[PDB]
Amino acid sequence: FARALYDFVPENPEMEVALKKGDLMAILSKKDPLGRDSDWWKVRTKNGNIGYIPYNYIEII
């Protein structure tokens, strides 16, 4: 899946995941709708945190 680059934080206090520099996360979505180019994906951390996360903040296995 993916890894955590920098300490991430809920972009919005409604739906997002949290990351602590070095953490890890599983990415599913891409651009999300169409699937073009940009850094913004959806993730699942330890199956406990489900939300989004800029691609420039996570590592691709």
* Distance in Å from the first CA to the final CA of the chain: 6
Q: Which residue has the tokens 């691609």?
A: 55
Cα torsion angle, 39, 32, 59, 17, sign: positive
Residue with tokens 């599913």: 28
CATH number of the domain enclosing 40: 2.30.30.40
Cβ–Cβ under 8 Å, residues 20 and 7:
yes
Residue in 16, 26, 6, 11 with CA at minimum distance from that of residue 50: 16
CA-based angle 35:40:46, to the nearest 5? Answer: 110
Which residues constitute the domain of residue 45?
Answer: 1-61
For residue 15, what are the CA distances in angstroms to 2, 11, 18, 42, 60?
19, 8, 10, 11, 22
Exposure string over 19-41, b if 16+ CB within 10 A, otherwise e: beeebbbbbeeeeeeeeeeeeeb
What was the elucidation method? NMR
Q: How many domains does the chain have?
A: 1
